[PDB]
A paper describes a structure:
We recently discovered a novel BtNR that is capable of reducing a variety of nitro compounds. The dimeric BtNR-F3 structure was determined to be 2.0 Å. The mutated residues from BtNR wt 11AYNFRHA17 to BtNR-F3 11DGLSGAT17 represent the flavin fix site. The FMN phosphate group shifts 1.6 Å toward OG1 of Thr17, to which it is covalently attached. The phosphate group in BtNR wt is stabilized by the side chains of Arg15, Lys209, and Arg211 and the backbone nitrogen of Ala17. In BtNR-F3, besides the covalent linkage to Thr17, the interaction with R211 remains.
By using a flavin transferase and carving a flavinylation motif in target proteins, we demonstrate that “dissociable” flavoproteins can be turned into covalent flavoproteins. The elucidated crystal structures confirm that the covalent attachment does not significantly perturb the binding and microenvironment of the redox active part of the flavin cofactor.
Residue numbers in the entry:
A (entry chain B): 17 to 221
B (entry chain A): 16 to 221
Write the structure that this text describes.
Protein backbone atom coordinates (compact mmCIF):
# COMPACT_ATOMS: atom_id res chain seq x y z
CA UNK A 1 0.00 0.00 0.00
CA UNK A 2 1.63 3.17 -1.30
CA UNK A 3 -0.25 6.31 -2.37
CA UNK A 4 2.73 8.41 -3.46
CA UNK A 5 6.04 7.80 -5.15
CA UNK A 6 9.40 9.46 -5.51
CA UNK A 7 9.16 11.29 -8.86
CA UNK A 8 12.93 11.11 -9.31
CA UNK A 9 13.49 7.39 -8.62
CA UNK A 10 12.56 5.31 -11.68
CA UNK A 11 12.18 1.55 -11.82
CA UNK A 12 14.82 0.22 -14.19
CA UNK A 13 13.81 -0.99 -17.65
CA UNK A 14 14.68 -4.55 -16.74
CA UNK A 15 12.95 -4.53 -13.32
CA UNK A 16 9.81 -3.21 -15.02
CA UNK A 17 10.12 -5.85 -17.80
CA UNK A 18 10.18 -8.45 -15.04
CA UNK A 19 6.95 -7.01 -13.56
CA UNK A 20 5.25 -6.92 -17.00
CA UNK A 21 6.48 -10.45 -17.70
CA UNK A 22 4.94 -11.82 -14.50
CA UNK A 23 1.70 -10.26 -15.78
CA UNK A 24 1.99 -11.90 -19.20
CA UNK A 25 2.88 -15.26 -17.65
CA UNK A 26 -0.10 -15.11 -15.25
CA UNK A 27 -2.66 -17.95 -15.46
CA UNK A 28 -6.11 -17.19 -16.85
CA UNK A 29 -9.35 -19.19 -17.00
CA UNK A 30 -9.19 -21.40 -20.11
CA UNK A 31 -5.74 -19.94 -20.93
CA UNK A 32 -7.46 -17.12 -22.85
CA UNK A 33 -5.19 -14.38 -21.45
CA UNK A 34 -8.03 -11.82 -21.93
CA UNK A 35 -5.95 -8.79 -21.07
CA UNK A 36 -3.69 -6.02 -22.26
CA UNK A 37 -1.18 -3.97 -20.26
CA UNK A 38 -0.98 -0.38 -21.36
CA UNK A 39 1.99 1.42 -19.82
CA UNK A 40 1.28 5.15 -19.67
CA UNK A 41 4.55 7.09 -19.39
CA UNK A 42 3.44 10.08 -21.49
CA UNK A 43 3.02 12.94 -18.97
CA UNK A 44 0.21 14.55 -20.90
CA UNK A 45 -1.78 11.33 -21.17
CA UNK A 46 -1.36 10.76 -17.41
CA UNK A 47 -2.74 14.24 -16.80
CA UNK A 48 -5.79 13.58 -19.01
CA UNK A 49 -6.48 10.40 -17.02
CA UNK A 50 -5.86 12.15 -13.73
CA UNK A 51 -8.72 14.57 -14.31
CA UNK A 52 -11.13 11.61 -13.95
CA UNK A 53 -9.09 9.35 -11.68
CA UNK A 54 -9.93 10.63 -8.18
CA UNK A 55 -8.10 7.63 -6.72
CA UNK A 56 -4.72 8.53 -8.35
CA UNK A 57 -4.27 12.27 -7.69
CA UNK A 58 -0.81 11.71 -6.24
CA UNK A 59 0.03 8.39 -7.97
CA UNK A 60 -0.37 9.55 -11.54
CA UNK A 61 2.11 12.51 -11.33
CA UNK A 62 4.70 10.62 -9.26
CA UNK A 63 4.62 6.97 -10.40
CA UNK A 64 7.68 5.59 -12.12
CA UNK A 65 5.38 3.45 -14.29
CA UNK A 66 1.56 3.56 -14.58
CA UNK A 67 -0.43 0.70 -16.09
CA UNK A 68 -3.94 0.48 -17.49
CA UNK A 69 -5.03 -3.14 -17.43
CA UNK A 70 -7.65 -3.77 -20.07
CA UNK A 71 -9.88 -6.82 -20.29
CA UNK A 72 -11.38 -8.34 -23.38
CA UNK A 73 -15.05 -7.70 -24.07
CA UNK A 74 -17.86 -10.09 -24.99
CA UNK A 75 -16.90 -9.37 -28.64
CA UNK A 76 -13.63 -11.30 -28.15
CA UNK A 77 -14.11 -13.77 -25.24
CA UNK A 78 -17.57 -15.16 -25.86
CA UNK A 79 -17.01 -18.85 -26.65
CA UNK A 80 -17.52 -18.47 -30.41
CA UNK A 81 -15.44 -15.32 -30.95
CA UNK A 82 -12.62 -15.15 -33.51
CA UNK A 83 -10.15 -14.00 -30.84
CA UNK A 84 -10.54 -17.38 -29.11
CA UNK A 85 -10.03 -19.32 -32.40
CA UNK A 86 -6.92 -17.29 -33.29
CA UNK A 87 -5.68 -17.62 -29.71
CA UNK A 88 -6.07 -21.40 -29.54
CA UNK A 89 -4.49 -21.89 -32.98
CA UNK A 90 -1.67 -19.30 -32.88
CA UNK A 91 -0.69 -19.20 -29.18
CA UNK A 92 -1.77 -22.63 -27.84
CA UNK A 93 -0.98 -24.34 -31.17
CA UNK A 94 -4.21 -26.34 -30.92
CA UNK A 95 -5.15 -28.52 -33.94
CA UNK A 96 -8.46 -27.59 -35.58
CA UNK A 97 -10.26 -30.62 -34.11
CA UNK A 98 -8.83 -30.10 -30.62
CA UNK A 99 -9.93 -26.45 -30.73
CA UNK A 100 -13.51 -27.40 -31.75
CA UNK A 101 -13.78 -29.55 -28.64
CA UNK A 102 -12.19 -26.82 -26.52
CA UNK A 103 -14.67 -24.24 -27.81
CA UNK A 104 -17.59 -26.61 -27.12
CA UNK A 105 -16.34 -26.96 -23.58
CA UNK A 106 -15.97 -23.18 -23.33
CA UNK A 107 -19.51 -22.84 -24.58
CA UNK A 108 -21.00 -25.22 -21.99
CA UNK A 109 -18.89 -23.51 -19.28
CA UNK A 110 -20.08 -20.00 -20.17
CA UNK A 111 -23.73 -20.83 -20.79
CA UNK A 112 -24.50 -23.34 -18.07
CA UNK A 113 -21.73 -23.65 -15.46
CA UNK A 114 -21.19 -19.95 -14.59
CA UNK A 115 -24.07 -18.30 -16.54
CA UNK A 116 -21.67 -15.79 -18.16
CA UNK A 117 -23.92 -15.06 -21.14
CA UNK A 118 -26.50 -13.27 -18.95
CA UNK A 119 -25.15 -9.98 -20.33
CA UNK A 120 -22.12 -8.56 -22.12
CA UNK A 121 -21.01 -6.99 -18.86
CA UNK A 122 -21.13 -10.37 -17.11
CA UNK A 123 -18.66 -11.75 -19.69
CA UNK A 124 -16.53 -8.64 -19.47
CA UNK A 125 -16.43 -8.93 -15.65
CA UNK A 126 -15.33 -12.58 -15.96
CA UNK A 127 -12.42 -11.56 -18.17
CA UNK A 128 -11.72 -8.65 -15.79
CA UNK A 129 -11.42 -11.13 -12.91
CA UNK A 130 -8.55 -12.82 -14.79
CA UNK A 131 -6.84 -9.40 -15.00
CA UNK A 132 -7.00 -9.09 -11.20
CA UNK A 133 -4.85 -12.26 -11.02
CA UNK A 134 -2.27 -10.51 -13.23
CA UNK A 135 -2.66 -7.38 -11.10
CA UNK A 136 -1.90 -9.27 -7.89
CA UNK A 137 1.05 -11.09 -9.44
CA UNK A 138 2.49 -7.86 -10.85
CA UNK A 139 2.22 -6.18 -7.46
CA UNK A 140 3.83 -9.19 -5.71
CA UNK A 141 6.64 -9.34 -8.29
CA UNK A 142 7.23 -5.64 -7.75
CA UNK A 143 7.34 -6.09 -3.98
CA UNK A 144 9.88 -8.91 -4.36
CA UNK A 145 12.33 -6.54 -6.03
CA UNK A 146 11.71 -3.63 -3.64
CA UNK A 147 9.23 -1.82 -5.93
CA UNK A 148 6.08 -0.32 -4.41
CA UNK A 149 2.74 -0.40 -6.14
CA UNK A 150 -0.81 0.84 -5.88
CA UNK A 151 -3.94 -0.73 -7.45
CA UNK A 152 -6.42 1.92 -8.61
CA UNK A 153 -10.17 1.57 -9.15
CA UNK A 154 -11.01 5.16 -8.18
CA UNK A 155 -11.94 6.51 -11.64
CA UNK A 156 -15.07 7.54 -13.53
CA UNK A 157 -15.63 4.71 -15.98
CA UNK A 158 -17.55 6.84 -18.47
CA UNK A 159 -14.70 9.34 -18.84
CA UNK A 160 -11.90 6.77 -18.80
CA UNK A 161 -13.71 4.67 -21.37
CA UNK A 162 -14.19 7.69 -23.61
CA UNK A 163 -10.56 8.75 -23.33
CA UNK A 164 -9.26 5.28 -24.10
CA UNK A 165 -11.73 4.83 -26.91
CA UNK A 166 -10.77 8.12 -28.59
CA UNK A 167 -7.12 7.14 -28.26
CA UNK A 168 -7.84 3.91 -30.16
CA UNK A 169 -6.59 1.83 -27.22
CA UNK A 170 -9.76 -0.30 -26.99
CA UNK A 171 -9.19 -1.66 -30.54
CA UNK A 172 -12.66 -1.38 -32.05
CA UNK A 173 -14.46 -2.64 -28.93
CA UNK A 174 -12.06 -5.56 -28.21
CA UNK A 175 -11.17 -4.12 -24.78
CA UNK A 176 -12.43 -2.09 -21.88
CA UNK A 177 -10.71 -0.62 -18.81
CA UNK A 178 -10.47 -3.18 -16.02
CA UNK A 179 -8.18 -1.69 -13.41
CA UNK A 180 -5.14 0.58 -13.03
CA UNK A 181 -1.82 0.13 -11.24
CA UNK A 182 0.93 2.57 -10.28
CA UNK A 183 4.53 1.40 -9.68
CA UNK A 184 7.48 3.25 -8.14
CA UNK A 185 9.47 3.88 -4.96
CA UNK A 186 7.55 5.03 -1.90
CA UNK A 187 8.60 8.33 -0.35
CA UNK A 188 7.35 7.26 3.07
CA UNK A 189 6.43 4.17 5.06
CA UNK A 190 2.86 2.95 4.45
CA UNK A 191 0.05 2.80 6.97
CA UNK A 192 0.68 -0.48 8.92
CA UNK A 193 -1.71 -3.15 7.51
CA UNK A 194 -4.95 -3.82 9.38
CA UNK A 195 -6.88 -6.98 8.42
CA UNK A 196 -9.82 -9.05 9.67
CA UNK A 197 -9.38 -11.54 12.47
CA UNK A 198 -8.18 -14.85 11.01
CA UNK A 199 -11.27 -16.66 12.30
CA UNK A 200 -13.48 -14.14 10.47
CA UNK A 201 -11.98 -14.84 7.01
CA UNK A 202 -10.81 -18.48 7.36
CA UNK A 203 -12.90 -21.59 8.01
CA UNK A 204 -11.62 -25.17 7.93
CA UNK A 205 -13.95 -27.95 6.78
CA UNK B 1 3.27 -23.39 -12.88
CA UNK B 2 0.25 -25.11 -14.52
CA UNK B 3 -0.60 -28.29 -12.60
CA UNK B 4 -3.73 -30.40 -13.03
CA UNK B 5 -2.70 -33.29 -10.79
CA UNK B 6 -0.92 -33.63 -7.48
CA UNK B 7 0.83 -36.31 -5.47
CA UNK B 8 -1.88 -37.57 -3.08
CA UNK B 9 0.80 -38.69 -0.60
CA UNK B 10 2.83 -35.48 -0.38
CA UNK B 11 1.19 -32.93 1.92
CA UNK B 12 2.08 -29.27 2.29
CA UNK B 13 3.14 -28.72 5.89
CA UNK B 14 0.73 -26.81 8.12
CA UNK B 15 3.37 -24.08 8.38
CA UNK B 16 3.94 -23.78 4.63
CA UNK B 17 0.20 -23.67 3.97
CA UNK B 18 -0.25 -20.94 6.63
CA UNK B 19 2.24 -18.88 4.61
CA UNK B 20 0.05 -19.34 1.51
CA UNK B 21 -3.22 -18.57 3.39
CA UNK B 22 -1.69 -15.57 5.13
CA UNK B 23 -0.52 -13.97 1.89
CA UNK B 24 -4.13 -14.35 0.74
CA UNK B 25 -5.57 -12.69 3.83
CA UNK B 26 -2.98 -9.90 3.69
CA UNK B 27 -3.91 -9.16 0.07
CA UNK B 28 -5.08 -5.63 -0.81
CA UNK B 29 -8.73 -5.02 -1.64
CA UNK B 30 -10.70 -2.09 -3.05
CA UNK B 31 -11.58 0.26 -0.16
CA UNK B 32 -9.82 -2.19 2.19
CA UNK B 33 -13.09 -4.07 2.58
CA UNK B 34 -11.41 -7.53 2.37
CA UNK B 35 -14.68 -8.94 0.93
CA UNK B 36 -13.63 -12.57 1.12
CA UNK B 37 -13.54 -15.79 3.02
CA UNK B 38 -11.14 -18.71 2.61
CA UNK B 39 -12.71 -22.09 3.18
CA UNK B 40 -10.12 -24.83 3.43
CA UNK B 41 -11.75 -28.14 2.61
CA UNK B 42 -9.58 -30.99 3.91
CA UNK B 43 -12.56 -33.25 4.74
CA UNK B 44 -12.40 -35.92 1.98
CA UNK B 45 -16.19 -36.37 2.08
CA UNK B 46 -16.81 -32.69 1.50
CA UNK B 47 -14.30 -32.72 -1.38
CA UNK B 48 -16.24 -35.59 -2.93
CA UNK B 49 -19.56 -33.71 -2.71
CA UNK B 50 -17.92 -30.73 -4.47
CA UNK B 51 -16.24 -33.00 -7.00
CA UNK B 52 -19.60 -34.26 -8.30
CA UNK B 53 -20.21 -30.80 -9.81
CA UNK B 54 -16.66 -29.55 -10.23
CA UNK B 55 -15.69 -30.90 -13.66
CA UNK B 56 -12.57 -28.72 -13.58
CA UNK B 57 -11.11 -30.45 -10.52
CA UNK B 58 -11.76 -34.17 -11.19
CA UNK B 59 -8.11 -35.03 -10.48
CA UNK B 60 -7.24 -31.96 -8.34
CA UNK B 61 -9.87 -32.47 -5.61
CA UNK B 62 -8.84 -36.08 -4.74
CA UNK B 63 -5.10 -35.45 -4.91
CA UNK B 64 -4.61 -31.88 -3.63
CA UNK B 65 -2.78 -31.39 -0.38
CA UNK B 66 -5.03 -28.42 0.37
CA UNK B 67 -8.20 -27.25 -1.39
CA UNK B 68 -9.60 -23.77 -0.94
CA UNK B 69 -12.97 -22.25 -1.74
CA UNK B 70 -12.65 -18.51 -2.03
CA UNK B 71 -15.97 -16.83 -1.27
CA UNK B 72 -16.85 -13.22 -1.99
CA UNK B 73 -19.17 -10.99 -0.01
CA UNK B 74 -22.59 -10.40 -1.58
CA UNK B 75 -24.69 -7.25 -2.16
CA UNK B 76 -26.11 -7.90 1.31
CA UNK B 77 -22.72 -7.11 2.88
CA UNK B 78 -20.72 -4.87 0.51
CA UNK B 79 -23.36 -2.54 -0.90
CA UNK B 80 -22.28 0.91 0.32
CA UNK B 81 -24.96 1.08 3.05
CA UNK B 82 -24.57 -2.45 4.43
CA UNK B 83 -23.86 -3.13 8.11
CA UNK B 84 -20.80 -5.27 7.31
CA UNK B 85 -19.07 -2.10 6.01
CA UNK B 86 -19.82 -0.04 9.16
CA UNK B 87 -18.60 -2.83 11.48
CA UNK B 88 -15.60 -3.38 9.23
CA UNK B 89 -14.54 0.29 9.13
CA UNK B 90 -15.07 0.68 12.88
CA UNK B 91 -13.63 -2.59 14.21
CA UNK B 92 -10.90 -3.48 11.68
CA UNK B 93 -9.89 -0.09 10.22
CA UNK B 94 -10.50 1.69 13.56
CA UNK B 95 -12.26 4.53 11.76
CA UNK B 96 -13.93 7.18 13.99
CA UNK B 97 -17.69 7.31 13.47
CA UNK B 98 -17.39 10.65 11.60
CA UNK B 99 -14.60 9.39 9.34
CA UNK B 100 -16.60 6.25 8.51
CA UNK B 101 -19.73 8.26 7.57
CA UNK B 102 -17.66 10.16 5.01
CA UNK B 103 -16.06 6.95 3.76
CA UNK B 104 -19.52 5.39 3.25
CA UNK B 105 -20.75 8.41 1.28
CA UNK B 106 -17.67 8.11 -0.90
CA UNK B 107 -18.32 4.37 -1.27
CA UNK B 108 -21.83 5.15 -2.40
CA UNK B 109 -20.78 7.62 -5.09
CA UNK B 110 -18.04 5.17 -6.18
CA UNK B 111 -20.43 2.22 -6.52
CA UNK B 112 -23.33 4.09 -8.11
CA UNK B 113 -21.60 6.52 -10.44
CA UNK B 114 -17.87 5.83 -10.91
CA UNK B 115 -17.98 2.09 -11.74
CA UNK B 116 -21.79 1.48 -12.05
CA UNK B 117 -21.58 -1.47 -9.63
CA UNK B 118 -25.23 -1.21 -8.58
CA UNK B 119 -26.46 -2.15 -12.07
CA UNK B 120 -27.39 -5.47 -10.45
CA UNK B 121 -26.62 -7.60 -7.38
CA UNK B 122 -24.47 -9.68 -9.72
CA UNK B 123 -22.39 -6.68 -10.86
CA UNK B 124 -21.72 -5.74 -7.24
CA UNK B 125 -20.88 -9.34 -6.30
CA UNK B 126 -18.54 -9.50 -9.35
CA UNK B 127 -16.69 -6.45 -8.09
CA UNK B 128 -16.09 -8.15 -4.73
CA UNK B 129 -15.11 -11.35 -6.58
CA UNK B 130 -12.44 -9.43 -8.52
CA UNK B 131 -10.84 -8.56 -5.15
CA UNK B 132 -10.75 -12.30 -4.41
CA UNK B 133 -8.81 -12.89 -7.66
CA UNK B 134 -6.04 -10.66 -6.27
CA UNK B 135 -5.83 -12.93 -3.23
CA UNK B 136 -5.97 -15.97 -5.53
CA UNK B 137 -2.97 -14.76 -7.52
CA UNK B 138 -1.05 -13.85 -4.34
CA UNK B 139 -1.74 -17.26 -2.84
CA UNK B 140 -0.53 -18.95 -6.01
CA UNK B 141 2.65 -16.85 -6.15
CA UNK B 142 3.37 -17.43 -2.45
CA UNK B 143 2.94 -21.16 -3.04
CA UNK B 144 5.33 -21.05 -5.99
CA UNK B 145 7.92 -19.18 -3.88
CA UNK B 146 8.12 -22.16 -1.52
CA UNK B 147 8.03 -24.90 -4.16
CA UNK B 148 4.26 -25.53 -3.89
CA UNK B 149 2.17 -26.07 -7.03
CA UNK B 150 -1.32 -24.67 -7.42
CA UNK B 151 -4.33 -24.81 -9.68
CA UNK B 152 -7.15 -22.21 -9.87
CA UNK B 153 -10.57 -23.71 -10.59
CA UNK B 154 -13.63 -22.08 -12.13
CA UNK B 155 -14.84 -25.31 -13.77
CA UNK B 156 -17.93 -25.98 -11.62
CA UNK B 157 -21.71 -25.86 -11.92
CA UNK B 158 -22.61 -22.73 -9.98
CA UNK B 159 -26.13 -23.79 -9.06
CA UNK B 160 -25.03 -27.08 -7.46
CA UNK B 161 -21.96 -25.65 -5.71
CA UNK B 162 -24.00 -22.76 -4.35
CA UNK B 163 -26.61 -25.18 -2.99
CA UNK B 164 -24.00 -27.44 -1.37
CA UNK B 165 -22.19 -24.54 0.31
CA UNK B 166 -25.50 -23.03 1.37
CA UNK B 167 -26.73 -26.30 2.93
CA UNK B 168 -23.41 -26.68 4.74
CA UNK B 169 -23.97 -23.20 6.27
CA UNK B 170 -20.76 -21.80 4.76
CA UNK B 171 -22.44 -18.81 3.03
CA UNK B 172 -23.64 -17.31 6.37
CA UNK B 173 -27.24 -16.34 5.60
CA UNK B 174 -26.44 -14.96 2.11
CA UNK B 175 -23.34 -12.96 3.26
CA UNK B 176 -21.11 -14.93 0.83
CA UNK B 177 -21.17 -16.76 -2.44
CA UNK B 178 -18.62 -18.88 -4.28
CA UNK B 179 -16.07 -16.83 -6.19
CA UNK B 180 -13.37 -19.28 -7.27
CA UNK B 181 -11.56 -22.41 -6.08
CA UNK B 182 -7.86 -23.28 -5.73
CA UNK B 183 -5.98 -26.56 -5.31
CA UNK B 184 -2.52 -26.72 -3.71
CA UNK B 185 -0.03 -29.58 -3.69
CA UNK B 186 3.07 -31.14 -5.22
CA UNK B 187 2.94 -31.93 -8.94
CA UNK B 188 3.32 -35.56 -10.03
CA UNK B 189 5.53 -34.52 -12.95
CA UNK B 190 6.88 -31.34 -14.55
CA UNK B 191 4.23 -29.42 -16.57
CA UNK B 192 4.61 -28.59 -20.23
CA UNK B 193 6.25 -25.15 -20.67
CA UNK B 194 3.75 -22.24 -20.65
CA UNK B 195 2.45 -20.79 -23.91
CA UNK B 196 1.44 -17.14 -23.90
CA UNK B 197 0.84 -14.28 -26.35
CA UNK B 198 4.01 -12.52 -27.39
CA UNK B 199 4.88 -9.55 -25.19
CA UNK B 200 4.29 -7.06 -28.02
CA UNK B 201 0.71 -8.37 -28.40
CA UNK B 202 -0.27 -7.87 -24.73
CA UNK B 203 1.87 -4.84 -23.77
CA UNK B 204 1.56 -1.35 -25.28
CA UNK B 205 3.42 1.78 -24.21
CA UNK B 206 1.99 5.31 -24.41
Amino acid sequence: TTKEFDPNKKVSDSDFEFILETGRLSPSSLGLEPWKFVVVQNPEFREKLREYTWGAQKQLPTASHFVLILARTAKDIKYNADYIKRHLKEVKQMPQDVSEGYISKTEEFQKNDLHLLESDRTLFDWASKQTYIALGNMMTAAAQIGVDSCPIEGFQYDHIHRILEEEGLLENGSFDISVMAAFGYRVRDPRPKTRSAVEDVVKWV
